[PDB]
Design a protein around this ligand. Structure first.
Ligand SMILES: *Cc1c(COP(=O)(O)O)cnc(C)c1O
Ligand SMILES: *Cc1c(COP(=O)(O)O)cnc(C)c1O
Ligand SMILES: [Cl-]
Ligand SMILES: [Cl-]
Ligand SMILES: [Cl-]
Ligand SMILES: [Cl-]
Ligand SMILES: [Mg+2]
Ligand SMILES: [Mg+2]
Ligand SMILES: [Mg+2]
Ligand SMILES: [Mg+2]
Lengths: 360, 356
């Protein structure tokens, strides 16, 4: 039919082949005559999927053998409290770098559970940039240092990651995990709801340094201990099997296109199409982020006033664009361009933007 | 290519629900996107989300003063979320033990507060539901927790106790919406979807609103989810979509009373087979407590047990091995397990007995 361009911010576009694959075998997976949704997670067919999703991640991000990959329910939001529940012990401090709203939500949960600190923040200037690592206020009794790699709502992104040796570096990478190569051993733990860049909602990927967290924490509910899930290989209770399956399928697609390095090249190219459009618009479009901090995953911008904002967004929606409204907390526009968003969608958006401008 | 899905969790689903899912997997509701590709704040998703709640409300006749939540983490997370929210200082989490799942729930409460055992059939290896006249209740109970269907042991509450000193709370993971329910008997009901309602990944929580909080993590407060209509963070959108689909199928066949008729026929096929087997097959549960959802039984010795289960597998039956903790055999016959599968099982049971 008519064109649809999927710029949704979370859940978001999936690569077609992962969906076509799921559709074809939805009733009969691996010749079992059952859907993968109808299998025991103790079945060999399911365990194969579960293990493959782990191995694809390991290969794709080159995760070291002393790290384990967890598949957990609860979203990134649950990790905001699980992390301090496991590591924020008495006498220690949950140190946070604030670079957007998701960083604030993480901080708030640690505040419920222990001593927190703010290592650096760009909140004063409305989170238009990533602070300089030299500005980081570190504490000897920090339980960890927590960052948000990609600030989904504000459109900013870490270009690189700090070297931290006094405490584990922890990162919420929900909206840019596996959008580029990563040196996993810079971190003690990385977590990501899958629904932004890895597939479906309903599973959260947690890459953890095994020895930081494979030990029982006294007084923590069984389900909320990392140790529980490490020990049981994320099979302590029933996992989200279809979500993990779809994650597998998406990872297979990333591998098929050349991995993290190739997808980074694609992601830089799509982002460039949109930022050049902003930058050649003579101020008709104004990006929120400072140039050195521009996200490759979420492009945030405004028109010169709210009326033009609304007319632009209404025109987009009439032309088949989905998800461009900025997050409710900040308004404006947000083009989410995660791995699976196709480049011709980006070209289409540029065309929209240029004709709207010319005709305004 | 015959397969009979007796899996105990996750489990068989209705063919029409899976076929419907397949058909629109790439283009949901003419949006040209999968349901999996929609924003959870989209109207498109929001209608599905609400439709799933609406169908449960209709099918279980859930009163207006109850809210229906869709949470992640399984029934297992509920084991801790419940006392986290309700087991306040000076109160007691009171448990009725009718199997190992009961035990697992009680264990989480012991982390967080005072607990108590109102009654237990553990001594007799959980062959029955205790007499409600046996319950030991406390003025300061925060709740009374039961397990409606004891998935590993094959026993099930025939009816529920009239409890007025504290909210009655039930882990209904393996029998929710397998029969009509009087929801007003309970302060809270919870269940992973993956047995009677949908695929794994979503947990249904039906809660008396006014019943349910300083210092509990935001995500672990029921109030968070009640206030946000289970859209506080990103829900498991595909699982809730599939839940809707399964609920449409249950509605289409005539609702909770209709599915109960089917379920009672399914259970009747297996229990009659066991009872008519002259001791060749022996059910674990006392008759009066027999589950309609999980039928547990053993052959006269471990070797026959093993020979039967091997023969079963060769003949296309899946999931009949009993829980590792108890061995024997377990035929899970949740809502979507068809009558024809139970007939096939019967016929296999009879042939095996004849050929032994
Ligand atoms: C989407 C998002 C979250 C929220 O994830 P849920 O799975 O909805 O809890 C947290 N952090 C970041 C950076 C996100 O973009
Ligand atoms: C299946 C089951 C559970 C476990 O559910 P998860 O979703 O795996 O946590 C808990 N209680 C009962 C009665 C069950 O049958
Ligand atoms: Cl943000
Ligand atoms: Cl967001
Ligand atoms: Cl049990
Ligand atoms: Cl079980
Ligand atoms: Mg491949
Ligand atoms: Mg194209
Ligand atoms: Mg209908
Ligand atoms: Mg008879």
């Amino acid at each position: 039919v008519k064109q649809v361009f999927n710029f949704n911010a979370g859940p978001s576009a999936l690569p077609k082949p992962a969906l076509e694959r799921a559709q074809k075998e939805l009733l009969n997976f691996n010749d079992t005559q059952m859907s993968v949704m109808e299998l025991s997670h103790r079945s060999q067919s399911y365990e194969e999927v579960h293990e493959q999703a782990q191995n694809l991640l390991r290969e794709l991000l080159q995760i070291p053998n002393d790290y384990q990959i967890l598949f957990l329910q609860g979203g990134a939001s649950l990790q905001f409290t699980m992390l301090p529940m496991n590591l924020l012990t008495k006498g220690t401090i949950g140190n946070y770098v604030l670079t957007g709203s998701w960083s604030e939500k993480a901080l708030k949960e640690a505040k419920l559970l222990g001593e927190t600190h703010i290592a650096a923040s760009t909140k004063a200037n409305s989170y238009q940039s990533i602070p300089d690592f030299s500005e980081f206020q570190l504490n000897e009794n920090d339980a960890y240092l927590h960052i948000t790699s990609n600030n989904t709502i504000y459109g900013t992104q870490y270009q690189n990651f700090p070297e931290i040796n006094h405490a584990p570096l922890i990162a919420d990478m929900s909206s840019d995990i596996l959008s580029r190569p990563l040196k996993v051993n810079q971190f003690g733990m990385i977590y990501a709801g899958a629904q932004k860049n890895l597939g479906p909602s309903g599973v959260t990927v947690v890459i953890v340094k095994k020895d930081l967290l494979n030990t029982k924490v006294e007084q923590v509910p069984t389900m909320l201990q990392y140790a529980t899930h490490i020990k049981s290989d994320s099979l302590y209770n029933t996992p989200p099997t279809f979500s993990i399956y779809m994650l597998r399928n998406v990872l297979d697609w990333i591998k098929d296109l050349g991995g993290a390095e190739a997808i980074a090249k694609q992601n830089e190219e799509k982002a460039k199409i949109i930022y050049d459009t902003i930058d050649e618009s003579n101020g008709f479009y104004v990006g929120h982020a400072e140039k050195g901090s521009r996200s490759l995953m979420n492009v945030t911008f405004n028109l010169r006033n709210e009326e033009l904002n609304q007319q632009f967004l209404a025109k987009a929606k009439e032309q088949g664009f989905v998800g461009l409204n900025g997050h409710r907390s900040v308004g404006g526009c947000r083009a989410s361009i995660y791995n699976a968003v196709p480049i011709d969608a980006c070209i289409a958006l540029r065309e929209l933007m240029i004709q709207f401008k010319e005709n305004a």
